[PDB]
Amino acid sequence: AAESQLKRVIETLRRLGIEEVLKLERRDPQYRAVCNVVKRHGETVGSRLAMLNALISYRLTGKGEEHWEYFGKYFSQLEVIDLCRDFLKYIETSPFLKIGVEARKKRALKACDYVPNLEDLGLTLRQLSHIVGARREQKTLVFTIKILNYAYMCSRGVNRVLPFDIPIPVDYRVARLTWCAGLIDFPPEEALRRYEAVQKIWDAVARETGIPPLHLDTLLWLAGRAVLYGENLHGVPKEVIALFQWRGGCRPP
């Protein structure tokens, strides 16, 4: 089943080009928040704020979307002076960051002075892995690279396709979608533990479709909104949504 589902996924996602994915990224509320902050604060400060927000985008109790919207509103309308201090204050203030707030502050503090290199995202990922103390493939780090690409694209007014060798950010949602598409036969909880196995599947999809993993992430966001949450944004077509409804209860309420 897993082999035939992988083929179906590839041959369906082949109907979409990388240029269409890049266009969809402009619609992502994460992109919009980042871009609003970069326009307000410039590339260097805005990219650092977006980076720090991405680094602490975990244990959000289902509020990731609201959290990015709040980030964008908070910093788009506020002067930033001492970036580290201002970020730490934001962590304390946010309605969305209350779980483990002290450890969020400590992680942000580790990265507070770090200036990402937006034109060498591979070196940036390696540096972040040392700063944060995580494997390069860990969800929050690869997600941070995606967010940094959003900041770069917005700042420079360009498209830039991410590397194939940076894997997809595997959170419980992505694990659930992978299971819902019949690509794994072990449950989402186990998949999340074994997140590299999930990444390997999406790396095969990436290679065969021409859509790098961090861009496949965009498609999974849209498909997930439709299938898990019942919010059809019409960013992906009906046949893409249907991929993720292979298993019985993979349906909106």
Side-chain angles (χ1 to χ4, degrees), residues 49-93:
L49 291 168
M51 183 189 70
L52 294 170
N53 202 60
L55 287 173
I56 63 165
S57 293
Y58 64 83
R59 291 189 71 202
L60 299 178
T61 313
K63 299 301 190 175
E65 290 73 25
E66 291 87 352
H67 155 74
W68 282 96
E69 176 175 356
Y70 181 84
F71 168 79
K73 292 183 200 155
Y74 184 101
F75 285 109
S76 287
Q77 77 172 330
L78 192 67
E79 181 80 14
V80 170
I81 300 297
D82 185 301
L83 194 153
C84 184
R85 289 188 202 153
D86 291 350
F87 198 79
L88 270 44
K89 179 173 181 173
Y90 156 81
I91 292 172
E92 297 170 9
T93 303

Side-chain angles (χ1 to χ4, degrees), residues 148-176:
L148 291 173
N149 200 51
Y150 285 182
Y152 182 74
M153 291 196 293
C154 153
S155 176
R156 302 303 179 81
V158 301
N159 286 316
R160 176 183 52 203
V161 179
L162 289 162
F164 284 92
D165 67 358
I166 301 178
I168 200 165
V170 181
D171 58 9
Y172 182 73
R173 179 178 52 79
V174 165
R176 287 201 63 193

Side-chain angles (χ1 to χ4, degrees), residues 5-69:
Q5 291 299 105
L6 177 59
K7 184 184 165 60
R8 177 175 168 191
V9 168
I10 288 166
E11 293 177 350
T12 303
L13 293 180
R14 273 187 185 139
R15 294 166 58 84
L16 305 180
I18 183 59
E19 181 184 8
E20 295 160 69
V21 186
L22 284 162
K23 281 189 186 300
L24 287 165
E25 289 177 356
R26 276 62 179 184
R27 307 284 65 81
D28 182 351
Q30 294 168 155
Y31 182 98
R32 296 187 270 102
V34 171
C35 202
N36 288 344
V37 172
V38 164
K39 291 177 172 160
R40 174 63 176 77
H41 291 291
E43 180 172 306
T44 80
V45 169
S47 72
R48 288 170 68 189
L49 291 168
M51 183 189 70
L52 294 170
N53 202 60
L55 287 173
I56 63 165
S57 293
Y58 64 83
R59 291 189 71 202
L60 299 178
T61 313
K63 299 301 190 175
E65 290 73 25
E66 291 87 352
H67 155 74
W68 282 96
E69 176 175 356

Side-chain angles (χ1 to χ4, degrees), residues 120-129 136 141-142 145 166:
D120 189 351
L121 291 177
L123 175 58
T124 293
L125 178 54
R126 190 167 31 266
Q127 293 171 330
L128 286 170
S129 83
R136 67 178 285 282
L141 293 186
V142 297
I145 299 301
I166 301 178

Side-chain angles (χ1 to χ4, degrees), residues 229-247:
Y229 304 96
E231 181 180 30
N232 190 0
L233 295 164
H234 292 266
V236 295
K238 65 190 188 283
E239 71 270 16
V240 171
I241 293 165
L243 292 173
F244 299 95
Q245 302 192 300
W246 190 75
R247 298 202 145 109

